[PDB]
């Protein structure tokens, strides 16, 4: 019954949950050509899994 | 409101009180007697005259 809606909410017997940040950006990430690719695992929201 | 232990204690202190406030301290129904049976009778239906 606790209201906290930035990390989870149900809708009825299936509760979606924001999953986020697999891999962290550093400030001297570049986008260089050897750089490791981060598969848009970094942003604020990627998915939403149910 | 019917099973008191729905209502979480750590969400609702308040509500939770006034649930089991409800459920202990309703006042109770009762009855009396009235009349005479013996030589009047009685119109009572769904009780005992």
Known sequence: ?50 | FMNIQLISPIDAPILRQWAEIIHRYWPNPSQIRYGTPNVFGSANLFTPP
């Open chain 1, 1 to 50: 019954g606790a209201a906290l809606s930035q990390f989870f909410q149900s809708h009825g017997e299936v509760l979606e949950v924001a999953a986020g940040r697999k891999y962290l950006q550093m400030n001297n990430y570049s986008n260089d050509d050897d750089d490791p690719p981060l598969f848009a695992k970094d942003l604020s929201d990627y998915a939403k899994a149910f």
